[PDB]
A paper describes a structure:
In the end, OaVMAT2 with the TM8/9 loop replaced by BRIL (OaVMAT2TM8/9-BRIL) or AmpC (OaVMAT2TM8/9-AmpC) yielded stable proteins with reasonable gel-filtration profiles. Subsequent cryo-EM single-particle analysis revealed OaVMAT2TM8/9-BRIL structure at 3.2 Å resolution. Interestingly, the OaVMAT2TM8/9-BRIL structure is organized as a homodimer, which was also confirmed by chemical crosslinking using glutaraldehyde. Surprisingly, OaVMAT2TM8/9-BRIL C-domain is folded in a unique way that is distinct from canonical MFS C-domains, which usually have TM11 and TM12 arranged near TM7. However, in OaVMAT2TM8/9-BRIL C-domain, TM11 and TM12 are positioned away from TM7, but close to TM8 and TM10. Interestingly, OaVMAT2TM8/9-BRIL retains binding capability to both dopamine (Kd = 0.68 ± 0.23 μM) and serotonin (Kd = 0.33 ± 0.10 μM). Notably, the basic amine group of dopamine/serotonin interacts with the acidic side group of D402 (TM10) via a salt bridge and the main-chain carbonyl oxygen of I398 (TM10) via a hydrogen bond. Meanwhile, the VMAT2 inhibitor reserpine bound to OaVMAT2WT with a high affinity (Kd = 16.0 ± 5.7 nM), but did not bind to OaVMAT2TM8/9-BRIL. Interestingly, crosslinked OaVMAT2TM8/9-AmpC also showed a minor dimer band, while the rest of the protein appeared as a monomer band (and a high-molecular-weight aggregate band). This data suggests that the oligomeric state of wild-type OaVMAT2WT is different from that of OaVMAT2TM8/9-BRIL (and maybe also OaVMAT2TM8/9-AmpC), and the dimer form of OaVMAT2TM8/9-BRIL may be an artifact induced by its non-canonical fold and engineering.
Author numbering:
A (entry chain B), B (entry chain A): 16 to 49, 133 to 274, 296 to 371, 384 to 394, 423 to 433, 453 to 548, 563 to 584
Write the structure that this text describes.
């Protein structure tokens, strides 16, 4: 009823503000120019790295809590970006914006999916939310440019912060240790996208003159993704087989021997047996814990692999020296997906919209002139091109 | 069996060569430079305009016939583009490639969908075909550049023509007055994309300095699309009710029915009534014929509207003068879709992949440097951004 419409409005505004914050910086780029590529892609990289952790956190705790802290982070980071003047401060504010926007978007989409039960209504709500997400990137630049050129210099950022604050207030009123681990995760995700070397002294002449070297250096990520997509399946099959192999003995005067080898919840189960439903419940209750632990392990392993590869990239003097790191990165981005797809399905849509809007805006701003070459965003774009049309 | 695998291989190769032909020209652009945006986007514009007509033609006649003429057109136009040296000849060859590739791709995808009956197998085949379609754009530039800078000047075009010929031969051997209307349809689609004034004398300065003018000029196509999406539904609902009302009076005793009967095929049907199944069959078949005629009419009307708008575009003297033509174009592109989606569903996937690959390649080539602003491709991109994530 009224609550469903309120939730839909809140989620729509959250996604719209997310993409507006992503794209609004395009008309201001020449003014700063009087390095740019990394400053532009930092938010997208951070969000694309940190989405699955927020998904798992919302699965564990719940939906309403992450949205408020996401709104607060977005507000604080937007204000800091508005009032900052130094390159490092701008980059830090951009990364904070990325984390906050990712958390808010994922949690809001999850709650909106949870509220609607009927299939067709759920599809309509998803369509409206994704439409707002997609049209934010187009409404960004004109709104930003008109406010920038009529009134003030930092007006668009303050207006967006005010909108964020108003939406948070509407969510709060009208609607009716682990901490160190979360801090470490946030800091690692910031650090991965904050620092990136490129060796532009000889790399520029390399890509401009000959592109076949670029292709042979950058395509093996596609093979690595396919190789790494199977890890969760393999491990889950092994874990499922292991428990049933043990329980086969219990499956089989001998009953007293079975009770003896059983020998305190398991003891109580063995006593109350002397059935099939009990062992079914036992398997189900252990299986979920195994799944959750394995998902956490694979997410951490993927983050570690990406960090190690980005730390190992700069120590190369040839194009072929770039073959080894790429094979790493495309692996990790695969593995994480293998654990997240069965439970949540809108991560593909969010990543696709973000990447495609970023490419659209970059093409527009590049055409506008008449800036640096991002490394991880190229891999993300290649993977998206190859495997998002196939998935749909 | 062998037949299904052979069809899958043929369709995969056809789609791969389609996209490779689309993208391979990128590394050659700077060499030719030492005007170009239209030359790059002509093929995409022509294909996106001419897809639905080929879809209807294949629905009417059959799948095998269009593929062979598409292969022949692709071969001839690729050779002509290879051996040409003048701007007009290059543009004409590009448009011919566009028509041939569109026909081959649509017909092959249709036949591949037709062969597979099982749902999961059909999904797998569609996934493989779209994977080839999507990887063509990445395999294009490296292959083209390496062939260009190792051997010869026109080697990649000849190699692609040879591959086209080999695939056509495999299709022909191993596998076991409307004409003037089709000619006019082809010529009009060529002419729409061949000529575009775009008025670049002062549009660039008022587009780069201020972006809100660009937004207010280009966004209303999104509203026009939503308005025009309902045309087929409204017309079909009106048409069905008119036929139903006439027969409902006679639907209802027997004496009155005979009395009305007192006043060749229709006579035979009326005699054999003296039942319900005959009425059902009559209604279904006449409705089907009416729907087919209405689809043809709306496709022609959309083409006419687009042509009139592109002829009326150059007259405008101010930015606001571009508001009226856009409201036209976004209408037609909507209306055609309203008639094509219920029967065929891969048109959205084909258009999305083509547009997104084109934007990716344009961004790459623009980034590599260090002119030309397409008009209709911008509208297509806006519509795709806004309404493809929602549709998926």
């Amino acid at each position: 009823r009224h609550s469903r419409k309120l939730v839909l409005f809140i989620v729509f505004l959250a996604l719209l503000l997310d993409n507006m914050l992503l794209t609004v910086v395009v008309p201001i780029i020449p003014s700063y120019l009087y390095q740019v590529g990394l400053l532009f892609a930092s938010k997208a990289t951070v969000q694309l790295l940190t989405n699955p952790f927020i998904g798992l956190l919302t699965n564990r705790i719940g939906y309403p809590i992450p949205m408020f802290t996401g709104f607060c982070i977005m507000f604080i980071s937007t204000v800091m970006f508005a009032f900052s003047r130094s390159y490092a401060f701008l980059l830090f504010a951009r990364s904070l914006q990325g984390i906050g926007s990712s958390c808010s978007s994922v949690a809001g989409m999850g709650m909106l999916a949870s509220v609607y039960t009927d299939d067709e209504e759920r599809g309509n709500a998803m369509g409206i939310a994704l439409g707002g997400l997609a049209m934010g990137v187009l409404v960004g630049p004109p709104f930003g440019s008109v406010l920038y050129e009529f009134v003030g210099k930092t007006a668009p950022f303050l207006v967006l912060a005010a909108l964020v604050l108003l939406d948070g207030a509407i969510q709060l009123f009208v609607l009716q240790y682990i901490l160190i681990a979360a801090g470490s995760i946030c800091f690692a995700n910031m650090g991965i996208a904050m620092l990136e070397p490129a060796l532009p002294i000889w790399m520029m002449e390399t890509m401009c003159s000959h592109k076949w070297q670029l292709g042979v250096a950058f395509l093996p990520a596609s093979i690595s993704y396919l190789i790494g997509t199977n890890v969760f399946g393999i491990l889950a099959r092994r874990q499922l087989a292991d428990l049933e192999d043990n329980w086969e003995t219990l499956n089989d005067q001998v009953k007293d021997a079975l009770t003896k080898m059983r020998a305190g919840f398991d003891i109580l189960v063995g006593q109350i047996d002397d059935l099939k439903t009990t062992r079914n419940a036992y398997i189900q209750k252990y299986l979920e814990r195994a799944r959750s632990t394995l998902r956490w392990l694979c997410a951490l392993l993927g983050m570690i692999i990406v960090g190690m590869s980005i730390l190992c990239i700069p120590l190369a003097k040839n194009i072929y020296g770039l073959i080894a790191p790429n094979f790493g990165v495309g692996f990790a981005i695969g593995m994480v997906d293998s654990s997240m797809m069965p439970i949540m399905g809108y991560l593909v849509d969010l990543r696709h919209v973000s990447v495609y809007g970023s490419v659209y805006a970059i093409a527009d701003v590049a055409f506008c002139m008449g800036i640096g070459f991002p490394w991880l965003m190229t891999i993300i774009g290649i993977i998206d091109i190859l495997f998002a049309p196939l998935c749909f």
